Swiss-Prot record, chain A:
Topology within the bilayer: Multi-pass membrane protein
E.C. code: 7.1.1.2
Sequence similarity: Belongs to the complex I subunit 6 family.
Spans through the membrane: 1-21, 25-45, 47-67, 88-108, 149-169
Pfam families (alphabetical): Oxidored_q3 (PF00499)
Keyword Membrane set for record: yes
Classification of source organism: Eukaryota, Metazoa, Chordata, Craniata, Vertebrata
Location in the cell: Mitochondrion inner membrane
GO terms of biological process kind: mitochondrial electron transport, NADH to ubiquinone; mitochondrial respiratory chain complex I assembly
Keyword set, alphabetical order: Electron transport, Membrane, Mitochondrion, Mitochondrion inner membrane, NAD, Respiratory chain, Translocase, Transmembrane, Transmembrane helix, Transport, Ubiquinone
Name of the protein: NADH-ubiquinone oxidoreductase chain 6
Principal EC category: translocase
From Swiss-Prot, chain B:
Cross-referenced Pfam families: Oxidored_q2
Protein's UniProt name: NADH-ubiquinone oxidoreductase chain 4L
Main location: mitochondrion
Membrane association type: Multi-pass membrane protein
Any one of the GO BP annotations: ATP synthesis coupled electron transport
Family (UniProt): Belongs to the complex I subunit 4L family.
Enzyme class: translocase
CC terms in the record's Gene Ontology section: mitochondrial inner membrane; respiratory chain complex I
Gene: MT-ND4L
Swiss-Prot record, chain D:
Catalytic activity: a ubiquinone + NADH + 5 H(+)(in) = a ubiquinol + NAD(+) + 4 H(+)(out)
A Gene Ontology cellular-component term: mitochondrial inner membrane
Organism of origin: Ovis aries
The organism's taxonomic lineage, starting at the top: Eukaryota, Metazoa, Chordata, Craniata, Vertebrata
Compartment(s): Mitochondrion inner membrane
Protein name (record): NADH-ubiquinone oxidoreductase chain 3
From Swiss-Prot, chain E:
InterPro entries: Complex_I_Subunit_2, NADH_DH_su2_C, NADH_UbQ_OxRdtase_chain2, ND/Mrp_TM
Gene Ontology molecular function terms on file: NADH dehydrogenase (ubiquinone) activity
Protein family membership: Belongs to the complex I subunit 2 family.
Membrane topology, record value: Multi-pass membrane protein
GO biological process, one term: mitochondrial respiratory chain complex I assembly
Protein name: NADH-ubiquinone oxidoreductase chain 2
Organismal lineage: Eukaryota, Metazoa, Chordata, Craniata, Vertebrata
GO CC terms in record: mitochondrial inner membrane; respiratory chain complex I
Length: 175, 98, 171, 115, 347, 318, 140, 71, 99, 74
């Protein structure tokens, strides 16, 4: 029955990600972020991405583990609040949900929405690859760049990471 | 127009407004910066896969390694802020008065 | 904008070589060896024109070459070719080391009784010259010509005219 | 969506384990079992108190080396192109830069404190 | 803060700015802005005090959100016509977001609320190097992407930036906030001329960087943060007084001194267009941003405040600091009126 | 029939966990000079079945401030992700023939860590907080080294596809081109699997079960089953990843028997390492892990980069 | 928006009244909503009721400035019938300034508002009638 | 051979689908029957809706999404 | 400024990442190779304002290669008219799965 | 001496140093380059008839062009 499945997974992503960015307690935010990263990996995987979504799932998720470690270490309230606790938190969460359901309504019962661009309402099996007899598998050769042609780029990226390491050590050392 | 682009731009704008308005936690501000990173990641990656422009799939890996080391820098700054105070609230930053 | 036209179903009647994909992958060495000499004209049409709906006549020609190849391998030697492709058919995706005795027996059949020396490595490679019937046409891109070139300002340049021609500070 | 089918079956299995835990066996007499237990005595407050931690550099260290894991992980697709020299050169340069940063923060006791 | 590591971090600031200057690929420009941010954080906190900590916090948040908004602009640019050249854009929305991200970075009037906060608590070396490079480097990018900018955006930001940098500067009895408000006013001037002839803007960049270099060198010469200390450096060091006089009148923009060649050449190649009401409004506001210079000059040299002693002790010890390059930059900043046809050195 | 294959994957893991609990108790008894469960039922077996029933009975119940959503969603995601690890595992032909499996292994292992993390936060009695941050530290340690050693051992022969890996395991096992890398990886699997307190600081006697201080008497089975599925999980992944058998071609039963025997005797070796050694230390884990494994792993990675150019052993990578 | 300031320039001058005055009220209320948004975002009025009250005061005062300006512009244009001289809008700017002084209930600020608003409004009509372009050529 | 088979198959879908369009839209005004989207005249590569439009769910689902998450 | 030490040293380090029709790593096409070859052959020796005076048509052809916006407009109109006619009940068509 | 300050670390530096040094003196990088050049992923296209090129042959059976035989030949 389903053919809008990337749009559907994107709606689940927008739900979890608005509830993420509505700022509850950051541990609930990280719950929202792991849900959002998982379904975003699902979006880019089911679009046709081979590995890069599972890659960013891994990387971005270990980053969220570090963010959990610091939000537990540094500062929490006497009682941490959840989405449905406060006036403002519940209000922003439900109005983000209302924007989501309202755009689903004004796409599914309409032709197009032009808030910033003419968005075409139908799922993205169009436009799409017409079965290229490749066997070179585009993302594999794509990340097989940065090494053959990518000379200067990995130089400045690794140099930025080395500078990042010495910068973090000297900021904590600056006492 | 590939309708999924609408919801991803919607998620970007919501993550931006969440980055801008915030109650007390700078941790949550860094967290929304991480989310905005993810939004630009997914939009650029779906762009590159619609275009089959697979020579330049450098945008995802390099954008997120750089913005993640930015987030690491912010986390160390939050370590220093919570070291030289009790908490990391937006209040008790109102010194150095303009 | 512009109009386009398509070939009707009068032109699109070429019988497919409706064998399974595994046997078609299996016999591919000698499929490229005996046949697939004239289809490089089809390939050259397809690259030098980048226009399918146009090279369909040599598509008919390569399809009848393939069907004639299968007719020749069915009518003559032999029968255990069926055993050979159903031995290569089974092992999930095709690995050419799963079944070697039957490859050797099929090769001895077709070699001692019909010919067709097997194209060894790397003979199914090796960029090819081929003569054609029509010569290669210009501008297969339906494109208009160049708008304008750049008028290159050149020549021996004079010394300056009255310094700066600002409010003052001549010389 | 076949792995989504497997995720669905495991979600149904996990929820049926929840419901067979809750609703089947016996009653639910509460009102002192819910009290927070540490080791035998009622403590002050609860958790969510500011719990100042030992390691500071180590989590950021994990983050940045996970990032260089991200740059290094396409090594098999590195190993098949006609530019062997740039391949081996930038591969050795990336791992050597990782070892250089590690060597700096190893020699400057960036791990020798509250580990 | 080992000095080898400080030379490394300064070379990375140089490297980030050169990577900005050097590429045609947009991701390299974003990498350059980011590496500039990463290395310009620990030029601050050279002291220990948490004023530098909060200033680095506020600067990091605003700088990184401007960089992420720029990445949004590039990504929407390649949602549209997909090329990695730094050229005329092919989206008005992406040009909008890109101009507003650069407006948040190099300082404009809705976006400048971090600038006196970052310059207040940090030492003078960090303040000098961030003002020079963080107001240098996106002018290169603006010079590159000028042919696709809605003029309302740049022009409104420039007008409002000049008038806010003027109106804020009258009240502060500090020094760094005076210098930061002057920076906002000069960035409004250096942005206002961009869409007409950008040689004016980049020569204004050269002259403004020479001026700010002379200013912060003359404040590295004596650890002064209030005008009280400027009066005591009147009483202890006499040539510093007349140099503060000349350079402050040169930041004012008076014609026989070399603070005039930036403004007036801009007004020339501005009013060769049909904009006259706007240059006279802008230059009346450039009359407005001169009064705090006048009261600063009054407090230094034209009047003579009472001075605390122990300067009786200090008189045996002369000015034994280090000067970066004080006299060359000074007489390049002051006596450069009649070389107005060094306009065309730039291109 | 795909639902039937789902059932023949979800049913044998349960019996695997239950009789693994039995073999834990009995091997641990015969190790410790005593005798294990011998009286009840046939020799032990129906007492782990009775343990399943016994822990079903105990009526789970909530703590004071323990927010119920996060609370009951932690061990459910634990057991769900501990099942969905076993999707691409090439028992002769796996369930989903993934084009990439080992990075999926790392992802779902990190998710198991998050499940332990969310349970330790949501249990909310300060000891679950202590144990949760101990788990966070030992995962700061053990997702760098295991992932990079993985990258090394897949660089020479694997290329992410486990069917091509079982093609590679024909002439020699991959224990011989990388044995010390394999030993460091076995240490890392024993750490990340969070059994064998040689490299585990969560179920100490210094604490009292920081992952399960007061969760609830019901889902202790869920969390328990998740960790022992982690044990079988990483031992099967070790048994596939390094060594094994050139299988009977297009014949599954011989390969399945030999693989099961190798994997389960290696799991007995794992349990026998648990039964032997004292517990470990926080700062000693950071020091030992980083400053003993990490430059040696980098050296093995660079030498396994250069070895396909020193001996032309570049893979035939599809 | 540019479209409805162009609507304010779209009326012949001339008189098509109630419409020029409604466009003036719309422009003034939009500017008042802008300034009220700034003044509620830069103050923390503490609380939301006082924020609504301050926004109501700034919007109603700026819209009343627009209303009184449009009224005296419409009446002066109907009476004296001269679209050349901007003296009608000089009177308009002074009337708006005196009513701004009335809504602030001071007299010196009101007289200065008459002077400055009258001169700037006469300048606006004067430069529009002779023709001075908005913000740019942008050519050379 | 695979190239020519794909050619005949996509030309069959294009001819039959323009006949479908010329049948199904021939009453609403506007709408030329088979004009190009583009100003030039070349063989534009189709989009899997020009080929696979209105094939009632299962066919387009097994065509455009089979390789992604099955086998 | 826009310094091209890139050009002056004679090292192409950043030009290879620029557009489509550059060297994708094995000799493959992109989705819109030919339309960029059209637009770049139109707009080389051209002063970037008569690229929009004169090379407008070919650049818009490239933009409609990328987004395929008018194609989606036409296809959506066809689907919606299909829906309204099958809602009316005028010749529920059999052409798929049959003749 | 220099060995057992941190012995597993010095052993790691030794295998790292031989990994740096040893691909310089390498008699097989040319074989890796030849094999990696001679695995075609895409179609070797034909070309226009010739201007009588006495190369790039008429049939890939003919060994005029660049063939490979050293796979079976060690
Ligand atoms: C005191 C105000 C002085 C304004 C500057 C002098 C000036 O040129 O004013 C003309 C300017 C604008 O006039 P203008 O210079 O644009 O006039 C050009 C006239 N045409 C188009 C016919 C060539 O007026 C003001 O600045 C008003 C104040
Ligand atoms: C038509 C012709 C118009 C001509 C306008 C000329 C400028 C106006 C007059 C300039 C001089 C004003 C002045 O000197 O005011 C004195 C006042 C400081 O004096 P006081 O407040 O007593 O401070 C004592 C503390 N030491 O100084 C101040 O408060 C200065 C306030 C700023 C004034 C800047 C100059 C005007 C710019 C207008 C911009 C629009």
């Amino acid at each position: 029955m389903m053919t809008y499945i990337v749009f559907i997974l994107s709606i689940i992503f927008v739900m979890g990600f608005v509830g993420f960015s509505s700022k509850p307690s950051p541990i609930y935010g990280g719950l929202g972020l792991i849900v959002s990263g998982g379904v975003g990996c699902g979006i880019v995987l089911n679009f046709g991405g081979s590995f890069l979504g599972l890659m960013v799932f891994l990387i971005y998720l270990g980053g969220m583990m570090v963010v959990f470690g610091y939000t537990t270490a540094m500062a929490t309230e006497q009682y941490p609040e959840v989405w449905v606790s406060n006036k403002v938190v519940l209000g922003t969460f439900i109005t983000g949900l209302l924007m989501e359901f309202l755009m689903v309504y004004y796409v599914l019962k309409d032709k197009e929405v032009e808030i910033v661009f003419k968005f075409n309402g139908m799922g993205d099996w169009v436009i799409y690859d017409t079965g290229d007899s490749g066997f070179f598998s585009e993302e594999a050769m794509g990340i097989a760049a940065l090494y053959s042609y990518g000379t200067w780029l990995v130089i400045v990226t690794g140099w930025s990471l080395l500078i990042g390491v010495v910068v973090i050590m000297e900021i904590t050392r600056g006492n | 127009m590939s309708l999924v682009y609408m919801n991803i731009m919607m998620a970007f704008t919501v993550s931006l407004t969440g980055l801008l308005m915030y109650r007390s936690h700078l941790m949550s501000s860094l967290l929304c910066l991480e989310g905005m990173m993810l939004s630009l990641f997914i939009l650029a990656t779906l762009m590159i896969l619609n275009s089959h422009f697979t020579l330049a799939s450098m945008m995802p890996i390099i954008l997120l390694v750089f913005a993640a080391c930015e987030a690491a820098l912010g986390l160390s700054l939050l370590v220093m802020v919570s070291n030289t105070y009790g908490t990391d609230y937006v209040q008790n930053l109102n010194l150095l008065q303009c | 904008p512009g109009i386009v036209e398509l070939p009707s179903l009068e032109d699109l009647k070429v019988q497919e070589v409706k064998v399974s994909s595994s046997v078609l992958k299996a016999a591919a060495h000698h499929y490229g060896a005996q046949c697939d000499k004239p289809n490089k004209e089809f390939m050259l049409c397809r690259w030098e024109e980048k226009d399918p709906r146009r090279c369909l006549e040599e598509g008919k020609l390569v399809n009848q070459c393939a069907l004639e190849f299968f007719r020749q391998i069915k009518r003559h030697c032999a029968e255990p070719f069926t055993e050979y492709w159903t031995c290569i058919d089974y092992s999930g995706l095709q690995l050419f080391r799963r079944c070697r005795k039957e490859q050797a027996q099929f090769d001895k059949c077709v070699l001692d009784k019909l010919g067709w020396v097997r194209p060894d490595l790397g003979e199914l490679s090796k960029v090819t010259k081929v003569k054609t019937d029509r010569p290669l046409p210009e501008n297969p891109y339906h494109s208009r010509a160049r708008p304008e070139p750049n008028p290159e300002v050149e020549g021996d340049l004079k010394p300056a005219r009255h310094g700066s021609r600002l409010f003052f500070w001549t010389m | 969506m076949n792995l989504m089918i497997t995720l669905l079956t495991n979600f149904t299995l996990a929820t049926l384990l929840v419901t067979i835990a809750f609703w089947l066996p016996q009653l639910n007499v509460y009102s002192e079992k819910t009290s927070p237990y540490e080791c035998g005595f009622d403590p002050m407050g609860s958790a969510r108190l500011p719990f100042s931690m030992k390691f500071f550099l180590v989590a950021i260290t994990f983050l940045l080396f996970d990032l260089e894991i991200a740059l290094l992980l396409p090594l098999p697709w590195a190993s098949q192109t006609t530019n062997l020299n740039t391949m081996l050169t930038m591969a050795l340069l990336l791992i050597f830069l990782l070892a250089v940063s590690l060597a700096y923060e190893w020699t400057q006791k960036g791990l020798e404190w509250t580990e | 803060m080992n000095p080898i590591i400080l030379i490394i971090i300064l070379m990375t600031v140089m490297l980030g700015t050169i990577i900005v200057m050097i590429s045609t690929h947009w991701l390299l420009i974003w990498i350059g802005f980011e590496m500039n941010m990463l290395a310009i954080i620990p030029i601050m906190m050279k002291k220990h005090n948490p004023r530098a900590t909060e200033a680095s916090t506020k600067y990091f948040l605003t700088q990184s959100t401007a960089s992420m908004l720029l990445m949004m602009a590039i990504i929407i640019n390649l949602m549209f016509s997909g090329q990695w050249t730094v050229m005329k854009l092919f989206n008005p929305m992406a040009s909008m977001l890109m101009t507003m991200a650069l407006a948040m970075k190099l300082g404009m009037a809705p976006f400048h609320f971090w600038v006196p906060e970052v310059t207040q608590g940090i030492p003078l070396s960090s303040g000098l190097i961030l003002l020079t490079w963080q107001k240098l480097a996106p002018m290169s990018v603006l010079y590159q992407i000028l042919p696709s900018i809605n003029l309302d955006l740049i022009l409104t930001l420039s007008i409002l930036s000049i008038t806010i940098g003027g109106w804020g500067g009258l009240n502060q009895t500090q020094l760094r906030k005076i210098m930061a408000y002057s920076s906002i006013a000069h960035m409004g001037w250096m942005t206002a001329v961009l869409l007409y002839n950008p040689t004016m803007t980049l020569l204004n960049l050269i002259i403004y960087i020479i001026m700010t270099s002379t200013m912060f060198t003359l404040f590295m010469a004596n650890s002064t943060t209030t005008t009280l200390s400027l009066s005591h450096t009147w009483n202890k060091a006499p040539i510093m007084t007349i140099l503060v006089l000349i350079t402050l009148l040169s930041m004012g923009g008076l014609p026989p001194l070399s603070g005039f060649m930036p403004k007036w050449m801009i007004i020339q190649e501005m009013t060769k267009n049909d904009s006259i009401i706007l240059p006279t409004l802008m230059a009346i506001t450039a009359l407005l941003n001169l009064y705090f210079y006048m009261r600063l000059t009054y407090s230094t040299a034209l009047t003579m405040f009472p001075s605390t002693n122990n300067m009786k002790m200090k008189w045996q010890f002369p000015t034994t600091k280090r000067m970066t390059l004080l006299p060359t930059m000074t007489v390049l900043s002051t006596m450069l009126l009649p070389l107005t046809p060094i306009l065309s050195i730039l291109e | 029939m795909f639902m039937i294959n789902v059932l023949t994957l979800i049913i044998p893991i349960l019996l695997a966990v239950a009789f693994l609990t039995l073999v834990e108790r009995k091997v641990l008894g015969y190790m410790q000079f005593r005798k294990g469960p011998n009286v009840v039922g046939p020799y032990g077996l129906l007492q782990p079945i009775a343990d399943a029933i016994k822990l079903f009975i105990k009526e789970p119940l909530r703590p004071a401030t323990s927010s119920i959503s996060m609370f009951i969603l932690a061990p459910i995601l634990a057991l769900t992700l501990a099942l969905t690890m076993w999707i691409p595992l090439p028992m002769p032909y796996p369930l989903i023939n993934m084009n990439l499996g080992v990075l999926f292994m790392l992802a779902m292992s990190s998710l198991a860590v998050y499940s332990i993390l969310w349970s330790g936060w949501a249990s909310n009695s300060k000891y679950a907080l202590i144990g949760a941050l101990r788990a966070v530290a030992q995962t700061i340690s053990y997702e760098v080294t295991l992932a990079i050693i993985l990258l090394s051992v897949l660089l020479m022969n694997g290329s992410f596809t486990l069917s091509t890996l079982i093609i590679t395991q024909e002439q020699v096992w991959l224990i011989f081109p990388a044995w010390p890398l394999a030993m460091m990886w076995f240490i890392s699997t024993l750490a990340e699997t969070n059994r064998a307190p040689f490299d585990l600081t969560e179920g100490e006697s210094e604490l009292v079960s920081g992952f399960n201080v007061e969760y609830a008497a019901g889902p202790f089975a869920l969390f328990f089953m998740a960790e022992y599925a982690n044990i079988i999980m990483m031992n099967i992944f070790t048994t596939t990843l390094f060594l094994g058998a050139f299988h009977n071609p297009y014949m599954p039963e011989l390969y399945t028997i030999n693989f099961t025997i190798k994997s389960l005797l290696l799991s007995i070796t794992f349990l026998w390492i648990r039964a032997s050694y004292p517990r470990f230390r926080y700062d000693q884990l950071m020091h030992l892990l980083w400053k003993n494994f990490l430059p040696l792993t980098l050296a093995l990675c660079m030498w396994h980069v250069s070895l396909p150019i020193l001996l032309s052993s570049i893979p035939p990578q599809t | 928006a540019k479209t409805l300031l162009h609507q304010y320039w779209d009326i012949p001058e001339g008189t098509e009244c109630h419409r020029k005055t409604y466009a003036a009220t719309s422009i003034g209320g939009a500017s008042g909503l802008v300034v009220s948004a700034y003044s509620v975002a830069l103050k923390t009025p503490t609380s939301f009721l006082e924020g609504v009250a301050r926004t109501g005061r700034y919007t109603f005062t700026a819209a009343a400035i627009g209303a009184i300006f449009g009224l005296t512009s419409c009446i002066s244009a109907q009476v004296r019938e001269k679209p050349d001289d901007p003296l009608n809008y000089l009177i308009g700017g002074c009337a708006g300034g005196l009513t701004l002084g009335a809504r602030t209930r001071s007299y010196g600020i009101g007289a200065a508002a008459c002077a400055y608003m009258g001169l700037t409004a006469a300048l606006v009509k004067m430069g529009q009638l002779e023709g001075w372009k908005v913000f740019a050529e942008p050519k050379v | 051979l695979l190239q020519a088979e794909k050619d005949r198959r996509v030309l069959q879908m294009l001819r039959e689908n323009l006949e479908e369009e010329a049948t199904i839209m021939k009453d609403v005004p506007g709408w030329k029957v088979g004009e190009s989207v583009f100003h030039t005249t070349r063989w534009v590569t189709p989009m899997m809706g020009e080929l696979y439009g209105l094939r009632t769910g299962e066919e387009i689902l097994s065509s455009t999404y089979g390789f992604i998450w099955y086998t | 400024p826009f310094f091209d030490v890139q050009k002056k040293l004679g090292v192409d380090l950043d030009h290879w990442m620029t557009i489509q029709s550059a060297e994708q790593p094995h000799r493959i096409p992109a989705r819109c190779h030919a339309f960029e070859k059209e637009w770049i052959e139109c707009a080389h020796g051209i002063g970037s304002i008569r690229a929009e005076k004169e090379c407008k048509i070919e650049f818009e052809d490239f933009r409609e290669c990328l987004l395929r916006q008018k194609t989606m407009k036409r296809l959506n109109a066809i689907k919606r008219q299909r829906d309204k006619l099958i809602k009316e009940g005028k010749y529920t068509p059999p052409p798929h799965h049959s003749g | 001496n220099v060995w057992a300050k941190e012995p597993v670390l010095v052993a790691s530096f030794a295998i790292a140093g031989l990994a740096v040094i040893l691909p310089t003196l390498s008699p097989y990088t040319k074989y890796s380059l030849m094999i990696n050049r001679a695995t075609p992923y895409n179609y070797p296209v034909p070309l226009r008839d010739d201007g009588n090129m006495p190369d790039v042959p008429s049939h890939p059976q003919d060994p005029q062009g660049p063939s490979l035989e050293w796979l079976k030949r060690l």
